[PDB]
Coordinates of C-alpha atoms and ligand atoms in Angstrom, one line a residue:
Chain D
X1 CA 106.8 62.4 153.0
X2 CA 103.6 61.2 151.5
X3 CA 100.6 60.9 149.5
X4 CA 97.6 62.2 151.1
X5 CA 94.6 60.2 151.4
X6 CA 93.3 60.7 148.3
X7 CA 96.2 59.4 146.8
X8 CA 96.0 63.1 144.9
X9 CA 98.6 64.8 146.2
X10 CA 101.7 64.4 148.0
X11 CA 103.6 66.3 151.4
X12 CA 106.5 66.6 153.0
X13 CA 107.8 68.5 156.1
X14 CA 112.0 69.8 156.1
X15 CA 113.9 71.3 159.0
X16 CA 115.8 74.5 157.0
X17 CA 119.3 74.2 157.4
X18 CA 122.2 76.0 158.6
X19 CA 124.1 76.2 154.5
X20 CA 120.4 77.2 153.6
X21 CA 120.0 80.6 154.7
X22 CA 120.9 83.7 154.0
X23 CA 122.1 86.6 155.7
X24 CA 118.8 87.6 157.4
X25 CA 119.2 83.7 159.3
X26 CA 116.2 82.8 156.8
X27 CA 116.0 80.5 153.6
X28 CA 116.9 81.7 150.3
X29 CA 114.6 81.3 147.2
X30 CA 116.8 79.4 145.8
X31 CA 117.0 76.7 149.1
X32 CA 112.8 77.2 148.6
X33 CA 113.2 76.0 144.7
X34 CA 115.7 73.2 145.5
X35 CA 113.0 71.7 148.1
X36 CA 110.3 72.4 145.9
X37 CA 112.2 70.3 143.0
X38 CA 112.7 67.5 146.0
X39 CA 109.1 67.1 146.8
X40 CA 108.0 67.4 143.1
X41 CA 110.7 64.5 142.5
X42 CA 108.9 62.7 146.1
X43 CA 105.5 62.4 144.9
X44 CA 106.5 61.4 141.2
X45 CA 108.1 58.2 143.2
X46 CA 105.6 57.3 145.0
X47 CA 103.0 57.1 142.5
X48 CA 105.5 54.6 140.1
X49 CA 106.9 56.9 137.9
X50 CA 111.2 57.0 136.9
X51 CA 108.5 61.6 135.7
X52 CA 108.4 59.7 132.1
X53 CA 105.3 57.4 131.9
X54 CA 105.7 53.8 130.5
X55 CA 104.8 55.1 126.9
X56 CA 107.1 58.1 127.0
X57 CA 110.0 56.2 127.3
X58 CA 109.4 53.9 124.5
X59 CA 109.1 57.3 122.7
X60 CA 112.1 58.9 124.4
X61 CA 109.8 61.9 125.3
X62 CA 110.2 64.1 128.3
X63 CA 108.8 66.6 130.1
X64 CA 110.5 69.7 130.5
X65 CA 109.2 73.3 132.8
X66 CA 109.0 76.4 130.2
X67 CA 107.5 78.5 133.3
X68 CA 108.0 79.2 136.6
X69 CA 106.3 81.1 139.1
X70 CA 107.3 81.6 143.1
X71 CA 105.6 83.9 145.7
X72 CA 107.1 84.0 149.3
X73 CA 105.1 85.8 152.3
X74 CA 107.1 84.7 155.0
X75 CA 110.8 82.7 154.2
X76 CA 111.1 80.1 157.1
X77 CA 113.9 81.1 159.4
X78 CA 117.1 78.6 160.1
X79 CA 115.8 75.5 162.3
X80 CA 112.1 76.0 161.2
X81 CA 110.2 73.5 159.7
X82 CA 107.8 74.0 156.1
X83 CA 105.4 71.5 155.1
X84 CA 105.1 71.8 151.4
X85 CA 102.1 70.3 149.3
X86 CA 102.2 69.7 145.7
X87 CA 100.3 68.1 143.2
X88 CA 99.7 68.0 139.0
X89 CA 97.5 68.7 136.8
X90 CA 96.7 68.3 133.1
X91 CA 96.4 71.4 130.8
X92 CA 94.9 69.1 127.8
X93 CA 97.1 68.6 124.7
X94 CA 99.0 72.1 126.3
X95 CA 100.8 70.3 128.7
X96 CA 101.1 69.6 132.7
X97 CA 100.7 72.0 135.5
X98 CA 102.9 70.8 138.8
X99 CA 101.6 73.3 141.9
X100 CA 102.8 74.0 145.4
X101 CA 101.6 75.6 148.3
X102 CA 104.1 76.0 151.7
X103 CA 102.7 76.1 155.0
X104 CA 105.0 77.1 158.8
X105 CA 104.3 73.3 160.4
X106 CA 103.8 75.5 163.8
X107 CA 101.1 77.8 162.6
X108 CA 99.7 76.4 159.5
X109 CA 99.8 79.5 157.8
X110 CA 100.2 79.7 154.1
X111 CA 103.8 81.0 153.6
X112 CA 104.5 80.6 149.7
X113 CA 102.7 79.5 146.7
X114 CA 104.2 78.2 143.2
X115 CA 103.6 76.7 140.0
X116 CA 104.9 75.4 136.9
X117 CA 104.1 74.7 133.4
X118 CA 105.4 71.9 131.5
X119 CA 105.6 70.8 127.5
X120 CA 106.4 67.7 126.1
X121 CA 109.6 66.9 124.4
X122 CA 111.6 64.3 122.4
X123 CA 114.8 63.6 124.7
X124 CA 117.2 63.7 121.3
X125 CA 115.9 66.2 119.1
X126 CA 114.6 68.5 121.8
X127 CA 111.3 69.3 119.5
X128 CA 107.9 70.4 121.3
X129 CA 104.8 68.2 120.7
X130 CA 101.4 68.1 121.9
X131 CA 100.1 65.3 124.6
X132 CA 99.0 62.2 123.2
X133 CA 96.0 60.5 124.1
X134 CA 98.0 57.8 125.0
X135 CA 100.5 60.0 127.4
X136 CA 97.6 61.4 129.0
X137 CA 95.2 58.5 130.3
X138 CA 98.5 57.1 132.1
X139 CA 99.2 60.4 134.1
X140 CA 95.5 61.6 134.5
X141 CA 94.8 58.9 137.5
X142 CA 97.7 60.6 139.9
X143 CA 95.3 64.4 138.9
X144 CA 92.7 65.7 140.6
X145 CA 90.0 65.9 137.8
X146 CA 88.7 69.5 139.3
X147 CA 90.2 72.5 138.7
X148 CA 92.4 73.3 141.6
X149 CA 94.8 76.1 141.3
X150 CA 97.6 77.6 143.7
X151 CA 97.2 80.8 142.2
X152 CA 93.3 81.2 141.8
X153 CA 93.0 84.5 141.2
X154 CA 97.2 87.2 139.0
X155 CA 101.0 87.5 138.4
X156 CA 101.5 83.7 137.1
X157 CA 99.7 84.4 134.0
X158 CA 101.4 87.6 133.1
X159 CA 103.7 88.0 129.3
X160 CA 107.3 88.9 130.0
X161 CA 108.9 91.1 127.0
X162 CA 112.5 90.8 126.3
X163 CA 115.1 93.1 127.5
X164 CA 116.5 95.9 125.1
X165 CA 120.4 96.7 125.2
X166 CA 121.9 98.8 127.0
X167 CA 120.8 96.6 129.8
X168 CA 120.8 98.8 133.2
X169 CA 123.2 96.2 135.5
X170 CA 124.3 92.7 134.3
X171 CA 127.0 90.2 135.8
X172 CA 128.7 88.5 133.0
X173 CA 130.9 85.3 132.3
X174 CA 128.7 83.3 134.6
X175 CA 129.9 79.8 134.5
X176 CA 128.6 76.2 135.8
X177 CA 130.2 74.0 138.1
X178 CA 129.8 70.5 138.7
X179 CA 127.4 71.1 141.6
X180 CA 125.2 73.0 139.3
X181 CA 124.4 69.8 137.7
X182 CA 122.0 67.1 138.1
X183 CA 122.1 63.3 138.2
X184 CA 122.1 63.6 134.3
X185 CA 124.5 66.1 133.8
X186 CA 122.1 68.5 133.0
X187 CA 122.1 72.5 134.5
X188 CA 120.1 72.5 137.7
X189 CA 117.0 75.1 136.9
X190 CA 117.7 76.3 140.5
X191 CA 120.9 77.6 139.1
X192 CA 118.9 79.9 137.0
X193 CA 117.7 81.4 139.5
X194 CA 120.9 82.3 141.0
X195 CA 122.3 83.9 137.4
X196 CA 119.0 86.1 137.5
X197 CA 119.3 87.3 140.7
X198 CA 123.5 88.1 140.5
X199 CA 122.7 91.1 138.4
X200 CA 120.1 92.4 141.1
X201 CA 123.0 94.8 143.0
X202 CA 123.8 94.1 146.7
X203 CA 121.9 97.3 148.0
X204 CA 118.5 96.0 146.6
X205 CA 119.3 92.0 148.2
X206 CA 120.5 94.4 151.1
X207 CA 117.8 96.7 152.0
X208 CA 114.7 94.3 150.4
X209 CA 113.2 90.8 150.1
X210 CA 112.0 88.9 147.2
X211 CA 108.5 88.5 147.0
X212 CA 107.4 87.2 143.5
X213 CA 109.8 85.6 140.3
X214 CA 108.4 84.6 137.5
X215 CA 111.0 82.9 135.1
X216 CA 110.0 81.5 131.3
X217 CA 112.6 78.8 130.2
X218 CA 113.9 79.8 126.5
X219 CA 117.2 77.0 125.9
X220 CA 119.1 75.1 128.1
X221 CA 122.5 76.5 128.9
X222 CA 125.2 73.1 128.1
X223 CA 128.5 72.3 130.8
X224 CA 130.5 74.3 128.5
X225 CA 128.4 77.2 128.4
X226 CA 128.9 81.1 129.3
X227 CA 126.2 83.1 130.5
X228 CA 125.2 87.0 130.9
X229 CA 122.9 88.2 133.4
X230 CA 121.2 91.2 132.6
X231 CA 118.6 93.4 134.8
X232 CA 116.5 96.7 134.0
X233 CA 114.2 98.7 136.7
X234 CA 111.0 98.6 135.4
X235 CA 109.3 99.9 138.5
X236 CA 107.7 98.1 146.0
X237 CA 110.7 97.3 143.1
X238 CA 110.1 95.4 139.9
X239 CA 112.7 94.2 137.6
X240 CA 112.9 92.6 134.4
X241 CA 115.8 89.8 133.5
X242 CA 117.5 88.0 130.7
X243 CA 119.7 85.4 131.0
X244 CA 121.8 85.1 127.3
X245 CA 124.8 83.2 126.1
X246 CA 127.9 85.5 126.4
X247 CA 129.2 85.1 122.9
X248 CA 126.4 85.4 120.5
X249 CA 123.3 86.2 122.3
X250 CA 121.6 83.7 122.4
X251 CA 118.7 83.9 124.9
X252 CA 118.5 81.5 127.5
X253 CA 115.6 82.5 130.1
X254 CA 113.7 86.1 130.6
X255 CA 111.6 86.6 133.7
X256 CA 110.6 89.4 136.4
X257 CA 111.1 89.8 139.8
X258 CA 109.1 92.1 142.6
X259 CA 111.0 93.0 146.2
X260 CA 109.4 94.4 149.0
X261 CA 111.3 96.7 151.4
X262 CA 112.3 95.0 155.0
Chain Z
X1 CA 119.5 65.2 165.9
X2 CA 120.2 64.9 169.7
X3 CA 123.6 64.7 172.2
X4 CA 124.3 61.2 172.7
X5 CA 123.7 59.6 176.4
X6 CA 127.2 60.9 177.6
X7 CA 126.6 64.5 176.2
X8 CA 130.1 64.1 174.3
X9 CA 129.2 63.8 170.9
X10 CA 125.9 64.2 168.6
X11 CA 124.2 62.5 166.1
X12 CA 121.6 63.4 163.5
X13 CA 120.3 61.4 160.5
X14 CA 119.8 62.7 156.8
X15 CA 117.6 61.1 154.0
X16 CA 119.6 61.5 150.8
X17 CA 118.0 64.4 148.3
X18 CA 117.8 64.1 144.3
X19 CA 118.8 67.5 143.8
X20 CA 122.2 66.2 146.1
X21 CA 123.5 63.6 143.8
X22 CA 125.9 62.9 140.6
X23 CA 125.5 61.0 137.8
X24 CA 126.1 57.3 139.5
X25 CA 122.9 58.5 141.8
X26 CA 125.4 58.7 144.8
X27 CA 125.7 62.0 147.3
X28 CA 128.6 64.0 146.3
X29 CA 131.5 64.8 148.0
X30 CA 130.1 68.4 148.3
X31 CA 126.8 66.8 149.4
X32 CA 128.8 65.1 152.1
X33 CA 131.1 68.4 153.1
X34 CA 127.6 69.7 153.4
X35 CA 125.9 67.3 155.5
X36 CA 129.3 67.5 158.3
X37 CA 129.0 71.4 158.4
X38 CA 125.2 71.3 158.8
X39 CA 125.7 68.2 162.1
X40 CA 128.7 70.3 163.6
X41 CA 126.5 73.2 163.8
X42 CA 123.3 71.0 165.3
X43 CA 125.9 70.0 167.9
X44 CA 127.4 73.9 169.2
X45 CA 123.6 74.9 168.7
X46 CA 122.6 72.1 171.4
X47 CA 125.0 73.0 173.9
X48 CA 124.8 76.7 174.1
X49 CA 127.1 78.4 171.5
X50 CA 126.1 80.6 168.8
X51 CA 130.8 78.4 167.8
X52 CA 132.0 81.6 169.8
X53 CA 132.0 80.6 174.0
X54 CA 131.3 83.9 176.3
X55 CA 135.2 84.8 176.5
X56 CA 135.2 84.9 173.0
X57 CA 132.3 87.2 171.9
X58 CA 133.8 89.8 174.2
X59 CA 137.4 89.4 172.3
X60 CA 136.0 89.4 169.2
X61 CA 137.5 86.0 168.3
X62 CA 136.5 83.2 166.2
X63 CA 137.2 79.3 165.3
X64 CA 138.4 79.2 161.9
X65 CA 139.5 76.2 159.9
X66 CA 142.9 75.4 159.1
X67 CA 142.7 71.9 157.4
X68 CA 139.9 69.5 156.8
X69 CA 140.5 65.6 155.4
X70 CA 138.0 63.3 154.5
X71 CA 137.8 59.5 153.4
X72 CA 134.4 58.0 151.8
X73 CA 134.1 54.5 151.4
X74 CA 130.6 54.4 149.8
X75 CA 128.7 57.3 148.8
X76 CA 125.2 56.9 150.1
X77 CA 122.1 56.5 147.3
X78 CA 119.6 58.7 146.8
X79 CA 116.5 58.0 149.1
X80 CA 119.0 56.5 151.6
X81 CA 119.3 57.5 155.6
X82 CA 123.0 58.8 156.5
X83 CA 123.9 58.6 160.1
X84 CA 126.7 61.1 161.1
X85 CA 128.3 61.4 164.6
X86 CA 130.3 64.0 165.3
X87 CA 132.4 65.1 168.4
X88 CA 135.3 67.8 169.3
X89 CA 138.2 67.9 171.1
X90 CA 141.0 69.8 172.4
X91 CA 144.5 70.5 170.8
X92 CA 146.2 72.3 174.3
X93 CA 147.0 75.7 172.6
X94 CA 147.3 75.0 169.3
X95 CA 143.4 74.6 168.8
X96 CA 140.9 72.3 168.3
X97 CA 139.7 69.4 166.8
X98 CA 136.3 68.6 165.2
X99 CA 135.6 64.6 164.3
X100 CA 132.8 62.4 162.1
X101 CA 132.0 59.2 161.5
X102 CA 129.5 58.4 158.8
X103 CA 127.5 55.4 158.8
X104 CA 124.6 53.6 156.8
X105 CA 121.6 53.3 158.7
X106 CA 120.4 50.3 157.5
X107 CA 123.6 48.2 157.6
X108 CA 124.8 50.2 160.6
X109 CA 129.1 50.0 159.0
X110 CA 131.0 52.9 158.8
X111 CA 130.7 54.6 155.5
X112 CA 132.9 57.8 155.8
X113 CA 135.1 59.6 158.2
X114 CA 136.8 62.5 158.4
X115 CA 138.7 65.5 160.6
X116 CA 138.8 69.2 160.8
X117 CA 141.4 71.6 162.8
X118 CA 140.3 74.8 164.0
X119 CA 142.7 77.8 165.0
X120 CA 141.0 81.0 167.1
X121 CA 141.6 84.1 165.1
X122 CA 140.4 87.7 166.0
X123 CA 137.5 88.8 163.5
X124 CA 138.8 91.7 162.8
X125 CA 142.1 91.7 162.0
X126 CA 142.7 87.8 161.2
X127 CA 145.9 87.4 163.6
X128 CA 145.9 84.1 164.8
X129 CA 146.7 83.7 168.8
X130 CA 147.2 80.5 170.8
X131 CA 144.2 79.0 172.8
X132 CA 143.9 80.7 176.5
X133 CA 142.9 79.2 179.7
X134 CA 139.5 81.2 180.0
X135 CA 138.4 79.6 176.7
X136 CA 139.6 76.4 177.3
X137 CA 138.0 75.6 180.2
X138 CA 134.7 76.7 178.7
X139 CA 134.9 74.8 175.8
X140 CA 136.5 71.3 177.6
X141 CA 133.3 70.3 179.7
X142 CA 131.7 69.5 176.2
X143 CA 134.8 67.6 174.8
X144 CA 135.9 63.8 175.8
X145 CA 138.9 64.2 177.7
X146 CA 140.3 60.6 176.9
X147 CA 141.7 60.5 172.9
X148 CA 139.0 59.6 170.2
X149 CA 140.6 59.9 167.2
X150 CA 138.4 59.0 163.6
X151 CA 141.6 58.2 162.1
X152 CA 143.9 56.7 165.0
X153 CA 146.4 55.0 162.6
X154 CA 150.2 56.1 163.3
X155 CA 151.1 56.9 159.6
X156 CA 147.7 58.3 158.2
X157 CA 147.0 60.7 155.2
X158 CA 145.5 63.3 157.5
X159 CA 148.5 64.5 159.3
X160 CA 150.0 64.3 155.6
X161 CA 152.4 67.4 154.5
X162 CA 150.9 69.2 151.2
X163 CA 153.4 71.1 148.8
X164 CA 152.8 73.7 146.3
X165 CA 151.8 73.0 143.1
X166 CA 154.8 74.8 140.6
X167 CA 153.8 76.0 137.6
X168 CA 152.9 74.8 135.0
X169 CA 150.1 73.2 136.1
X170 CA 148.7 70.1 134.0
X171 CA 145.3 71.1 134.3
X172 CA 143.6 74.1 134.7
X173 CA 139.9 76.1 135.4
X174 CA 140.2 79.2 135.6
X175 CA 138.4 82.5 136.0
X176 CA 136.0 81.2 138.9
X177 CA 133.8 83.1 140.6
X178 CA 131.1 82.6 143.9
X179 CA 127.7 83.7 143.3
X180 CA 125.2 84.6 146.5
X181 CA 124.6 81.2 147.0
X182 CA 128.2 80.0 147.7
X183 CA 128.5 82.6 150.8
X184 CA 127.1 81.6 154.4
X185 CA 124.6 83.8 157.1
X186 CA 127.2 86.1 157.0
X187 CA 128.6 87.1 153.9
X188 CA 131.5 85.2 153.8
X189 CA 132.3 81.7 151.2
X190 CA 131.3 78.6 152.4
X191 CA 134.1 76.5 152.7
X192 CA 132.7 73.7 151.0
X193 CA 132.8 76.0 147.5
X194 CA 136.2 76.1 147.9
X195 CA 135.7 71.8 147.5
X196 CA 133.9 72.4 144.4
X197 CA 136.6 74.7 143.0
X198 CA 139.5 72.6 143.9
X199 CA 137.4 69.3 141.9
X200 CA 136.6 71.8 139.2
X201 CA 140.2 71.3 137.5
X202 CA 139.8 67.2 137.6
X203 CA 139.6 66.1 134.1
X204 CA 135.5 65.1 133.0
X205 CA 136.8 61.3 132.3
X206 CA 138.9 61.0 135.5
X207 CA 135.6 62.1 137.1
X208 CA 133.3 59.7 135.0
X209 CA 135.6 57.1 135.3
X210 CA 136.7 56.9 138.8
X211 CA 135.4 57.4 142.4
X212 CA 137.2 60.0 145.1
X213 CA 138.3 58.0 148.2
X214 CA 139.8 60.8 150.1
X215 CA 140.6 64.7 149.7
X216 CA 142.6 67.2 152.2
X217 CA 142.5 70.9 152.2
X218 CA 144.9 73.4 154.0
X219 CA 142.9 76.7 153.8
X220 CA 145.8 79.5 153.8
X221 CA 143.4 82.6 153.1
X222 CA 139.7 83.6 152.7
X223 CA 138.1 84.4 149.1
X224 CA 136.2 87.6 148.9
X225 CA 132.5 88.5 147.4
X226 CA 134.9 90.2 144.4
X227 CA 138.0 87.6 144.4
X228 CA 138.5 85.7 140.8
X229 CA 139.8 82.2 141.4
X230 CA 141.9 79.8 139.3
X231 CA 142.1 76.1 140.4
X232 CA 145.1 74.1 139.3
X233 CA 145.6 70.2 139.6
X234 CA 148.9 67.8 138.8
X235 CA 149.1 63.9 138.8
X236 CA 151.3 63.0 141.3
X237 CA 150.9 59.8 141.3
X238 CA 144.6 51.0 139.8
X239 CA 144.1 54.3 141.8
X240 CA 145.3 58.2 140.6
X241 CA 146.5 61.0 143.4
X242 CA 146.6 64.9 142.6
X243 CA 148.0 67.9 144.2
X244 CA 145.7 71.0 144.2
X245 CA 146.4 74.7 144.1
X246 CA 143.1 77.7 144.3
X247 CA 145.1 81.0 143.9
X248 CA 143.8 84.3 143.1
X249 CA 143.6 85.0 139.3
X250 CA 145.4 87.9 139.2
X251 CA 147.8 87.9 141.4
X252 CA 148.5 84.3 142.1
X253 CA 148.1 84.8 146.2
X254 CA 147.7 81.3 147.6
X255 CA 143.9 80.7 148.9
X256 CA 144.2 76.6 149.7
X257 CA 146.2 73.7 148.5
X258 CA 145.1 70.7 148.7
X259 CA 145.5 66.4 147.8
X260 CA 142.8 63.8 146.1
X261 CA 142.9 60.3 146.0
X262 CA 140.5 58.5 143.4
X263 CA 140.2 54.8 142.8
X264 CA 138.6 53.1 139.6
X265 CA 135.0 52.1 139.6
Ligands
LIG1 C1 110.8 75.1 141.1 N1 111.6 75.3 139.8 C2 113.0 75.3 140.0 S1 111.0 74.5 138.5 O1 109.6 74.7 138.4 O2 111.8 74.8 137.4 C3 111.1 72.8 138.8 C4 110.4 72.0 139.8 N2 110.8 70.7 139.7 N3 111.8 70.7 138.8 C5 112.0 71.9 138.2
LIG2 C1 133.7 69.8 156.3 N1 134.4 71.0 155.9 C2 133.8 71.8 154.8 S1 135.1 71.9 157.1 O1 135.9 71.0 157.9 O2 135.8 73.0 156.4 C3 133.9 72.6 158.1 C4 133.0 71.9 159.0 N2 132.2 72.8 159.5 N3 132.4 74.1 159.0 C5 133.4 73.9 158.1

C-alpha cells in the first residue's frame, strides 16, 4: 500500500482469500467491509495519525461513522486481486467523509464504491460536537480541497424510517464473541453487518446477490450485549432493517438493503 | 506464495491486518488458525487438487480433520510480515498429516508451530474408512517421504490424550450460535469458529491477564447451520491449563473437546 502522488489519497491491492468467500467461491460484503476498514486504517498511518489528530487527544475526542454506504457490481472471486482507493474529506463543522472506490487489478474496472460519514465525539461521555477550527486545519492538509465524491450523482443520501413491529423475519439473541472485537475491545462495525443480514432468510442469500447497504449507526452494542435482527420487504428486492437490544428495545442501527437476482 | 525448490512444502507470507488483532495489538490465535488454513489451501491449490485427488472425487470422499495442536511463542504485531511454511505427510492407513512452521520475517526465528491429522470420510454418509492404495500413491509424490515432524520431541503435548470434561463445569458460555460468516464455500462451519467458541468460556481476566502458549482440539462431530452450542472450561492445572468441552445445548452430544495452556504476561 500507498499514498498516491499527490500525497491525497491512499491504495492498496489484496489477493481474496480462501475463509473470505462465500458460497458462490466469491467475497462476502462483509470480507469487502473488513478490507475497506484495513485500507481506511492504512492511509491514516501513513499520513502520521494514531485517526485522532494531536489536538483531539488532548481533548479525548474521537471520531466515530453514523453512516455507511456500500454498492458492489462485481464481488471479486477467491484468488483475485482488488485494488481499493480511499481518501477523506471534510464536511465543515458537520463532520468527515472517508470514500472508496474498488477496482479488478486485471481489468481496471470499477467494481464497488462506498462511503462514510463521521461525527465527532468525546471518548468518555460519548456526546456529539461540532469540528473545531482547531481540529480541522490539522486534518484538512491529508484532503483534497475539491469536491470529489464516490457517489456523484443517489442511494447514499437517502432517509431510512424505522421499522414498525410485527417485524416480517428477525434472528434474535445474537451475541458477540471475542473475534467480534477490535484492538480496544470495542464491537467490530463489520459485525453489524452480519446481524443485519442474519434475518435476510437463506432463499433470498440463496437465489440473489447484494448490491447496495446502507447502514445509519444509532448506539453501540457493549461485550455484554444481546441483539435482535429484524427485516421487512419493502419492495430487484429491497429490505428495511433494525438492529435493537433484545430486552428493552433499544435501537442500535436501522438501514436498507437492495439484492439483485443471480 | 510458491512450492519451495524441492516441491515438498510451500511458503507464503502475510502482513498482519488491524481488523486481525486483540487488545495487546498482537494477531490472535483465531488470526493465526486462519492464516494456516488459508497457506494449506495455497499449497493443494498449487499442485493440482481442488484437497480431493481424482480417486477421491469419484468415491465421493473427503479429508476431514480429526485433531489440530498449536504452540505460539510470540504473536506477530500489527503491520508485521508472518512467514508460514507448511508441508503434508503420510500416516500409512490411518491418514494424514498436515505441518507449519511460523516464522518472523525480519528476525527469520521460529515463532509458532503446529500440527493437524486428517481422516478420509465419505461425504455423504460420514463413515470413516482407512486410506487405500489408489489414494495413496496419488497423494505421496507431493509428500517428503523421510519424517519431518514440527514437533519431533518423544513426550510432546500433541500426541497428548484429552478427557471429558464432567459436569459441573467451572465456567460456562452458553447458547452460541454461527452466523453466515463462520461457515466456509460450502455451507459448512469453519473449524476455526469452533477455536473461538472453545476460548469463549475463558474467564475476561485470565484472558487480559495472560497469553495462550498452546491449545489442542479433537473434533468428534460437525455443528450445523441450526445447532445451539454451549462451551464449557475447568482448571486443571506461573502458567494456568484448561480442559474444554463444545456440546450441543440441548442435548449435550459431544462436538470437540479440547486443552489450553496460558502463561502470565
Ligand atoms: C466500512 N464500514 C464497516 S465503516 O464505514 O463502518 C468503517 C470504515 N472504517 N471503519 C469503519
Ligand atoms: C488450523 N486448524 C483450524 S485445522 O487444523 O482445523 C485446519 C487447517 N486447515 N483446515 C483446517
Amino acid at each position: 500500500g500507498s499514498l498516491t502522488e499527490d500525497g491525497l489519497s491512499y491504495k492498496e491491492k489484496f489477493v481474496v482469500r480462501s475463509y473470505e468467500v462465500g458460497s458462490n467461491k466469491t467475497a462476502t460484503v462483509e470480507t469487502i467491509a473488513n478490507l475497506l476498514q484495513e485500507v481506511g486504517c492504512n492511509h491514516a498511518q501513513s499520513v502520521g495519525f494514531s485517526a485522532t489528530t494531536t489536538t483531539m487527544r488532548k481533548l479525548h475526542l474521537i471520531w466515530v461513522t453514523a453512516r455507511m454506504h456500500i454498492e458492489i457490481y462485481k464481488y471479486p472471486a477467491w484468488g483475485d486481486v482488488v485494488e481499493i482507493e480511499t481518501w477523506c474529506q471534510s464536511e465543515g463543522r458537520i463532520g468527515t467523509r472517508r470514500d472508496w472506490i474498488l477496482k479488478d487489478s486485471v481489468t481496471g474496472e470499477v467494481t464497488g464504491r462506498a462511503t462514510s460519514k463521521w461525527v465527532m465525539m468525546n471518548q468518555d461521555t460519548r456526546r456529539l460536537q461540532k469540528v473545531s477550527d482547531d481540529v480541522r486545519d490539522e486534518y484538512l492538509v491529508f484532503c483534497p480541497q475539491e469536491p470529489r465524491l464516490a457517489f456523484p450523482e443517489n442511494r447514499s443520501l437517502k432517509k431510512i424510517p424505522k421499522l414498525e413491529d410485527p417485524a416480517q423475519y428477525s434472528m434474535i439473541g445474537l451475541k458477540p464473541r471475542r473475534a467480534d472485537l477490535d484492538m480496544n475491545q470495542h464491537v467490530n462495525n463489520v459485525t453489524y453487518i452480519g446481524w443485519v443480514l442474519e434475518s435476510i432468510p437463506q432463499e433470498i442469500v440463496d437465489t440473489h446477490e447484494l448490491q447496495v447497504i446502507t447502514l445509519d449507526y444509532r448506539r453501540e452494542c457493549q461485550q455484554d450485549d444481546v441483539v435482535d435482527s429484524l427485516t421487512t420487504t419493502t419492495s430487484d428486492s429491497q429490505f428495511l432493517h433494525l438492529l435493537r437490544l433484545s430486552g428493552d428495545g433499544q435501537e442500535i442501527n436501522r438501514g436498507t438493503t437492495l439484492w439483485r437476482k443471480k
